Amino acid sequence: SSDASGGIILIIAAILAMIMANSGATSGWYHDFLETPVQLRVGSLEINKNMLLWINDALMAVFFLLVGLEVKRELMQGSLASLRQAAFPVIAAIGGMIVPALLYLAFNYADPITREGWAIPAATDIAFALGVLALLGSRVPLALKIFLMALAIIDDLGAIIIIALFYTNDLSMASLGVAAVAIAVLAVLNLCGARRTGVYILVGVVLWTAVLKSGVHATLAGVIVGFFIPLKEKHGRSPAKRLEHVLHPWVAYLILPLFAFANAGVSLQGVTLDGLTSILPLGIIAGLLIGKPLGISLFCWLALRLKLAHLPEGTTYQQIMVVGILCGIGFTMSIFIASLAFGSVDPELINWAKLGILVGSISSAVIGYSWLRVRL
C-alpha cells in the first residue's frame, strides 16, 4: 500500500540531490550551506559543529529510535523472540555482514580504507529493500518481508554497535557521566512504570546532547530510548506500539527522505570520471561496489548452510536468495555508515564511496528485482 510510496519519494530525493549538487546554479548554495559552522548554545554550554553533522546526528538519531523500537518488539514479541524464530535471520545476517566485509576488507587490507571496509557494504537500506519488494503485487511476501527486515536491522544496528566499540570513545568525562545518569533515569523511569512516552523522549534528547561529540553515539541514543520506552500492553494499550506507529510515516516520508537530500547529492561532474575510472579505482569503490552485489553470495552460503536444523518459515524456497540480493542496496544506510567512516576524517574519497555504494546499489536493485518478478 504505502510501504513503497516512500521508496519512490526517497529516490526522488536522491535525484533532486544530484541535480542540486552538480547544477552549478545551486551546486554553490547547496555545498555552501551544507557545510557551514553552526554553534548552538543553551545557556552555558556551547556546541559548535557543521550543518550536515547536526542534521545527521539529528536525523539518524530519530531514525534509529524507531529502529530501536522495532528491534525490541521483534525481540520481545514477534519475528525474533524465540531462539527458534531467530536462529535463521541471525545466522542469515551474521553472515550478511561478514562476507561483504571479508570481501571488501580483504579487497583493501591497505591503509586509510581498512576502517572503511569494516562496514560500509554491511548496512542495507531497510527502507528501500522493502520498497522494491512492495512494487510486486502481494503474493509471496507477508513472511518474506517480515524476514528481510530482520537482517537490515541486525546488520545495520549491528554495524553501528561494532563501530561504537571499535572507536576509542571520546569519553568526555562529564558527558560520559551525564549519559549515565540520563541512561539511568530511563531505567528507574521504566521500572516505576511510566508510560507517559513524552518523558522518555526528553531524557533521550538530554542523553543525545550528552554524547553529542561522537555521531555514532548520538545515533545510538535513539536506539537506547526506543529500547526503554514501555512495551507490555499491561496498561490496556502500549505506549511503544503507538509511538512506533506515529513515527513510521514521519521517518519514511520526512526524515529518511530529508536525510537523503543532504547526503546523496554526490558530485560526479567536474571529474565525470568515465566508466572504469570508477570500477578501476581501488576497493574504496570496486570493493564496496561489489561487496554489495557479491554480498548476496553470503546467505547463499550462510542462510543456505542452514541444512542442519533451521526452518525457512512458510517461505518460498530458493526464492529467499532473491532477498539476499536486495540486502545489497545499503543506499542511505551505507551512505550514512560511510560518513561515519570518513566524513570528519579524510573526506574527499567520501564522494567516491557515495558513488560506489550508489552504483553497486542500483546495480543490485534491479539485478535482483526482475529475477523476482518472473517467479510469479
Swiss-Prot record:
Outcome when changing K292A: Loss of Na(+)/H(+) antiporter activity, but retains 30% of Li(+)/H(+) antiporter activity. Shows a wild type-like pH dependence and a similar apparent Na(+) affinity. Shows higher affinity for Li(+)
Spans within the Periplasmic topological domain: 24-50, 109-114, 169-172, 215, 265-278, 343-349
Record localization: Cell inner membrane
Outcome following mutation: H217 to C/S: Slightly reduced antiporter activity. No effect on pH sensitivity
Effect of H217A: Loss of antiporter activity. Abolishes ability to grow at alkaline pH
Chain ranges passing through the membrane: 4-23, 51-72, 89-108, 115-122, 147-168, 173-192, 197-214, 216-228, 246-264, 279-302, 332-342, 350-372
Result, substituting D155C: Loss of both Na(+)/H(+) and Li(+)/H(+) antiporter activities. Abolishes ability to grow on high salt medium. Cannot bind Li(+)
One function term, GO molecular function aspect: cardiolipin binding
Entry keyword set: Antiport, Cell inner membrane, Cell membrane, Ion transport, Membrane, Sodium, Sodium transport, Transmembrane, Transmembrane helix, Transport
Effect in UniProt of substituting K292Q: Does not affect growth with Na(+) at pH 7, but shows a moderate reduction in growth with Li(+). Growth is decreased by 3 orders of magnitude under high-Na(+) conditions at pH 8.2
Entry keyword annotation includes Cell inner membrane: yes
Record-marked site positions (Important for pH response): E233, E244, V246
Induction / repression: Expression is induced by Na(+) and Li(+). The Na(+)-dependent enhancement of expression is augmented by alkalinization.
Membrane topology term: Multi-pass membrane protein
UniProt-reported outcome of changing K292H: Retains 52% of Na(+)/H(+) antiporter activity and 88% of Li(+)/H(+) antiporter activity. Increases Km for Na(+) and Li(+). Does not affect pH-sensitivity. Decreases thermal stability
Organism domain of life: Bacteria
Activity modulation: Activity is regulated by pH. Active at alkaline pH. Activity is strongly down-regulated below pH 6.5 and a dramatic increase in activity is observed upon increase of the pH from 6.5 to 8.5.
Name assigned to this protein: Na(+)/H(+) antiporter NhaA
